[PDB]
Write a protein that binds this ligand. Structure first.
Ligand SMILES: Cc1c(OCCNCCCF)ncc(F)c1[C@@H]1c2[nH]c3ccccc3c2C[C@@H](C)N1C[C@@H](C)C(=O)O
Length: 231
């Protein structure tokens, strides 16, 4: 059978999100090349993950593309910041690619982006972000970032993810006041992730390459191509 997004319990939502998690990839090995190649390989896995986010396949192909076009960098960045949590002053791009601030100084303008990513990771570390909360946040990014009856459906799915976040906090023993405070603190970090993505996109455009950012067409092609993938 098929579970419709709005009928899932909080436990089922968490289970479906944890199950859809992409694998941890290795760097294939200069720095720019390694970071580009890794992002490209992670994008393929991001397509399969997005198709598994409850409510995402309920959207038209066009709406799915718009959401991925707006959110792809915020999604790579939140994944990066999550796995870099236990590595203060370093970014865990891959288990064979752990980079420090000074290493970012090799590429012009890259240190500014690394510093923002380091501060977000440090913030998640201080708040003791949990894996179940991280997966909720990543789905919120996907459904929220490109919002500007079908839009009401997206907002109802976003509401279900909020309910899921609150459920996790109430089960963790937080008071009603502490629940609203943590929810707000987590959602405010999403503003910082959007800012990092805009700065990241600007930096990517300040480069020689004419195909460094995924276009609407490439994202439509990848989403279309996914239909032809074997299960
Ligand atoms: C994301 C990216 C990148 O993306 C190109 C993708 N092209 C798609 C095909 C054409 F449609 N190209 C070069 C880069 F170095 C980076 C790196 C990078 N790599 C990653 C891998 C895994 C997880 C996270 C990251 C990040 C985040 C960040 C540090 N990025 C720097 C970018 C934004 C910049 O400021 O130039």
């Amino acid at each position: 059978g098929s579970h419709m997004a709005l009928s899932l319990t909080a436990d089922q939502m968490v289970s479906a999100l944890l199950d859809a998690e992409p694998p941890i990839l290795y760097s294939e090995y200069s720095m720019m090349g390694l970071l580009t190649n890794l992002a490209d390989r992670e994008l393929v896995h991001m397509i399969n993950w997005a198709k598994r986010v409850p409510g995402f396949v309920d959207l038209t192909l066009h709406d799915q593309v718009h959401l991925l076009e707006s959110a792809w960098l915020e999604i790579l960045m939140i994944g990066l910041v999550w796995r870099s949590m236990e590595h203060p002053g370093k970014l865990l791009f891959a288990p064979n690619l752990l980079l420090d601030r000074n290493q970012g100084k090799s590429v012009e303008g890259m240190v500014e982006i690394f510093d923002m990513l380091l501060a977000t990771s440090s913030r998640f570390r201080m708040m003791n972000l949990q894996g179940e909360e991280f997966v909720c946040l990543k789905s919120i990014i996907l459904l929220n970032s490109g919002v500007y009856e079908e839009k009401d459906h997206i907002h109802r799915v976003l509401d279900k993810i909020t309910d899921t976040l609150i459920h996790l906090m109430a089960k963790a023993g937080l008071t009603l006041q502490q629940q609203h405070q943590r929810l707000a603190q987590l959602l405010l970090i999403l503003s910082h992730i959007r800012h990092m993505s805009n700065k990241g996109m600007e930096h990517l455009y300040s480069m020689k390459s004419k195909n460094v950012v995924p276009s609407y067409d490439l994202l439509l092609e990848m989403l279309d191509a996914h239909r032809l993938h074997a299960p």
